[PDB]
Enzyme design. Structure first.
Site, PDB file in Angstrom:
ATOM      1  N   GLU A  35       0.824  -1.203   0.000  1.00 27.02           N
ATOM      2  CA  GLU A  35       0.000   0.000   0.000  1.00 27.02           C
ATOM      3  C   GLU A  35       0.864   1.262   0.000  1.00 27.02           C
ATOM      4  O   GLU A  35       0.557   2.214  -0.720  1.00 27.02           O
ATOM      5  CB  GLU A  35      -0.943   0.009   1.210  1.00 27.02           C
ATOM      6  CG  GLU A  35      -2.137  -0.971   1.175  1.00 27.02           C
ATOM      7  CD  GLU A  35      -3.188  -0.643   0.128  1.00 27.02           C
ATOM      8  OE1 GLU A  35      -3.055   0.370  -0.584  1.00 27.02           O
ATOM      9  OE2 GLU A  35      -4.165  -1.409   0.023  1.00 27.02           O
ATOM     10  N   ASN A  46      -8.166   9.822  -5.193  1.00 25.02           N
ATOM     11  CA  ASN A  46      -9.096   8.937  -5.896  1.00 25.02           C
ATOM     12  C   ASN A  46      -9.905   9.718  -6.941  1.00 25.02           C
ATOM     13  O   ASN A  46     -10.058  10.939  -6.855  1.00 25.02           O
ATOM     14  CB  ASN A  46     -10.041   8.252  -4.916  1.00 25.02           C
ATOM     15  CG  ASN A  46      -9.301   7.454  -3.873  1.00 25.02           C
ATOM     16  OD1 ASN A  46      -9.598   7.565  -2.686  1.00 25.02           O
ATOM     17  ND2 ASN A  46      -8.306   6.679  -4.296  1.00 25.02           N
ATOM     18  N   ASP A  48     -13.100   9.764  -7.304  1.00 23.88           N
ATOM     19  CA  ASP A  48     -14.310  10.324  -6.704  1.00 23.88           C
ATOM     20  C   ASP A  48     -14.030  11.540  -5.829  1.00 23.88           C
ATOM     21  O   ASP A  48     -14.962  12.078  -5.220  1.00 23.88           O
ATOM     22  CB  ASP A  48     -15.071   9.266  -5.887  1.00 23.88           C
ATOM     23  CG  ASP A  48     -14.325   8.821  -4.604  1.00 23.88           C
ATOM     24  OD1 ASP A  48     -13.234   9.345  -4.285  1.00 23.88           O
ATOM     25  OD2 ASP A  48     -14.866   7.960  -3.882  1.00 23.88           O
ATOM     26  N   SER A  50     -12.039  11.573  -3.137  1.00 26.45           N
ATOM     27  CA  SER A  50     -11.522  11.246  -1.818  1.00 26.45           C
ATOM     28  C   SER A  50     -10.000  11.099  -1.882  1.00 26.45           C
ATOM     29  O   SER A  50      -9.394  11.129  -2.959  1.00 26.45           O
ATOM     30  CB  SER A  50     -12.170   9.970  -1.288  1.00 26.45           C
ATOM     31  OG  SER A  50     -11.915   8.866  -2.143  1.00 26.45           O
ATOM     32  N   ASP A  52      -6.495   8.878  -0.042  1.00 28.00           N
ATOM     33  CA  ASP A  52      -5.969   7.784   0.767  1.00 28.00           C
ATOM     34  C   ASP A  52      -4.759   8.285   1.550  1.00 28.00           C
ATOM     35  O   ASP A  52      -3.850   8.891   0.957  1.00 28.00           O
ATOM     36  CB  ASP A  52      -5.564   6.656  -0.173  1.00 28.00           C
ATOM     37  CG  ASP A  52      -6.761   5.927  -0.728  1.00 28.00           C
ATOM     38  OD1 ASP A  52      -7.620   5.481   0.053  1.00 28.00           O
ATOM     39  OD2 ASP A  52      -6.876   5.874  -1.968  1.00 28.00           O
ATOM     40  N   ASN A  59      -9.027   5.729   3.618  1.00 33.13           N
ATOM     41  CA  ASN A  59      -9.827   6.596   2.738  1.00 33.13           C
ATOM     42  C   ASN A  59     -10.696   7.634   3.476  1.00 33.13           C
ATOM     43  O   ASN A  59     -11.343   7.325   4.478  1.00 33.13           O
ATOM     44  CB  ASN A  59     -10.719   5.649   1.912  1.00 33.13           C
ATOM     45  CG  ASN A  59     -11.434   6.326   0.771  1.00 33.13           C
ATOM     46  OD1 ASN A  59     -12.636   6.558   0.822  1.00 33.13           O
ATOM     47  ND2 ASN A  59     -10.699   6.604  -0.293  1.00 33.13           N
TER      48      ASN A  59
HETATM   49  C1  LIG Z   1      -8.790   1.042   3.675  1.00 33.22           C
HETATM   50  C2  LIG Z   1      -9.992   1.772   3.151  1.00 33.22           C
HETATM   51  O1  LIG Z   1     -10.280   2.900   3.539  1.00 33.22           O
HETATM   52  N1  LIG Z   1     -10.704   1.126   2.233  1.00 33.22           N
HETATM   53  C3  LIG Z   1     -11.856   1.713   1.552  1.00 33.22           C
HETATM   54  C4  LIG Z   1     -13.119   0.858   1.715  1.00 33.22           C
HETATM   55  O2  LIG Z   1     -13.569   0.907   3.065  1.00 33.22           O
HETATM   56  C5  LIG Z   1     -14.244   1.286   0.769  1.00 33.22           C
HETATM   57  O3  LIG Z   1     -15.247   0.262   0.676  1.00 33.22           O
HETATM   58  C6  LIG Z   1     -16.499   0.471   1.274  1.00 33.22           C
HETATM   59  O4  LIG Z   1     -16.389   0.477   2.694  1.00 33.22           O
HETATM   60  C7  LIG Z   1     -17.649   0.637   3.361  1.00 33.22           C
HETATM   61  C8  LIG Z   1     -17.358   0.802   4.834  1.00 33.22           C
HETATM   62  O5  LIG Z   1     -16.754  -0.372   5.364  1.00 33.22           O
HETATM   63  C9  LIG Z   1     -18.512  -0.589   3.070  1.00 33.22           C
HETATM   64  O6  LIG Z   1     -19.723  -0.456   3.834  1.00 33.22           O
HETATM   65  C10 LIG Z   1     -20.170  -1.552   4.587  1.00 33.22           C
HETATM   66  O7  LIG Z   1     -20.748  -2.567   3.781  1.00 33.22           O
HETATM   67  C11 LIG Z   1     -21.014  -3.778   4.508  1.00 33.22           C
HETATM   68  C12 LIG Z   1     -21.616  -4.756   3.524  1.00 33.22           C
HETATM   69  O8  LIG Z   1     -20.738  -4.993   2.430  1.00 33.22           O
HETATM   70  C13 LIG Z   1     -21.895  -3.598   5.749  1.00 33.22           C
HETATM   71  O9  LIG Z   1     -21.570  -4.610   6.702  1.00 33.22           O
HETATM   72  C14 LIG Z   1     -21.760  -2.232   6.430  1.00 33.22           C
HETATM   73  O10 LIG Z   1     -22.998  -1.818   7.000  1.00 33.22           O
HETATM   74  C15 LIG Z   1     -21.219  -1.084   5.576  1.00 33.22           C
HETATM   75  N2  LIG Z   1     -20.686  -0.032   6.436  1.00 33.22           N
HETATM   76  C16 LIG Z   1     -21.263   1.155   6.573  1.00 33.22           C
HETATM   77  C17 LIG Z   1     -22.517   1.384   5.779  1.00 33.22           C
HETATM   78  O11 LIG Z   1     -20.802   2.017   7.313  1.00 33.22           O
HETATM   79  C18 LIG Z   1     -18.755  -0.775   1.574  1.00 33.22           C
HETATM   80  O12 LIG Z   1     -19.256  -2.083   1.331  1.00 33.22           O
HETATM   81  C19 LIG Z   1     -17.476  -0.582   0.754  1.00 33.22           C
HETATM   82  N3  LIG Z   1     -17.784  -0.339  -0.655  1.00 33.22           N
HETATM   83  C20 LIG Z   1     -17.349  -1.132  -1.629  1.00 33.22           C
HETATM   84  C21 LIG Z   1     -16.521  -2.308  -1.200  1.00 33.22           C
HETATM   85  O13 LIG Z   1     -17.600  -0.915  -2.809  1.00 33.22           O
HETATM   86  C22 LIG Z   1     -13.748   1.556  -0.653  1.00 33.22           C
HETATM   87  C23 LIG Z   1     -14.782   2.184  -1.564  1.00 33.22           C
HETATM   88  O14 LIG Z   1     -15.160   3.487  -1.122  1.00 33.22           O
HETATM   89  O15 LIG Z   1     -12.645   2.466  -0.593  1.00 33.22           O
HETATM   90  C24 LIG Z   1     -11.521   1.922   0.071  1.00 33.22           C
HETATM   91  O16 LIG Z   1     -10.430   2.778  -0.071  1.00 33.22           O
END
Ligand SMILES: CC(=O)N[C@@H]1[C@@H](O)[C@H](O[C@@H]2O[C@H](CO)[C@@H](O[C@@H]3O[C@H](CO)[C@@H](O)[C@H](O)[C@H]3NC(C)=O)[C@H](O)[C@H]2NC(C)=O)[C@@H](CO)O[C@H]1O
Ligand SMILES: [Cl-]
Ligand code: NA
EC number: 3.2.1.17
Length: 129
Positions: A35, A46, A48, A50, A52, A59
């Site tokens: 990373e 990113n 969008d 945002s 890192d 993020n």
């Molecule tokens: C290291 C880092 O910052 N990585 C980033 C990722 O966190 C991010 O992915 C999205 O993260 C959110 C928060 O964890 C995910 O939301 C959760 O989704 C699951 C179900 O899949 C659920 O249990 C939770 O309720 C929910 N959390 C909430 C709503 O707070 C979400 O699924 C991810 N989105 C994806 C994988 O597409 C990505 C994309 O923004 O960025 C990384 O940098």
């Protein structure tokens, strides 16, 4: 600060990452290597809008506040600049929160594409520990 491999491994273990949520120390060292190349000051924009931040590239859309990502959240309740310190404490506490949110270490794209399923124990070879 550019950490050494064993130096970062010992720091991660002292802050309680070894086997947190079942992920061995080598997994976290491998993830940091791909990373940020062990550079605490790493930043990447990113598409969008945002950003890192830090040794584990956390993020701004969900985990920290940088004041320039409209519509974001701040689940680690912390300035994103605090993830760039030479002391990794803030990054580790936030990473502990991230890996517990539901999708484990798949939150880190570099871990999924380059570390998952490989012989990650190699990353702690030779370290006293
Ligand atoms: C290291 C880092 O910052 N990585 C980033 C990722 O966190 C991010 O992915 C999205 O993260 C959110 C928060 O964890 C995910 O939301 C959760 O989704 C699951 C179900 O899949 C659920 O249990 C939770 O309720 C929910 N959390 C909430 C709503 O707070 C979400 O699924 C991810 N989105 C994806 C994988 O597409 C990505 C994309 O923004 O960025 C990384 O940098
Ligand atoms: Cl990748
Ligand atoms: Na935010």
């Amino acid at each position: 600060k550019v950490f050494g491999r064993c130096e970062l491994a010992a720091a991660m273990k002292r802050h309680g990452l070894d086997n947190y949520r079942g992920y061995s120390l080598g997994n976290w060292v491998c993830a940091a290597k791909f990373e940020s190349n062990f550079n605490t000051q790493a930043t990447n924009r990113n598409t969008d809008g945002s950003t890192d931040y830090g040794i584990l590239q956390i993020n701004s859309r969900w985990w920290c506040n940088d004041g320039r990502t409209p519509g974001s959240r701040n689940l680690c309740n912390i300035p994103c600049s605090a993830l760039l310190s030479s002391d990794i404490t803030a990054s580790v506490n936030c990473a502990k929160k991230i890996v517990s949110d539901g999708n484990g270490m798949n939150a880190w794209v570099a871990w999924r594409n380059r570390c998952k399923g490989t012989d990650v124990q190699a990353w702690i070879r030779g370290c006293r520990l």
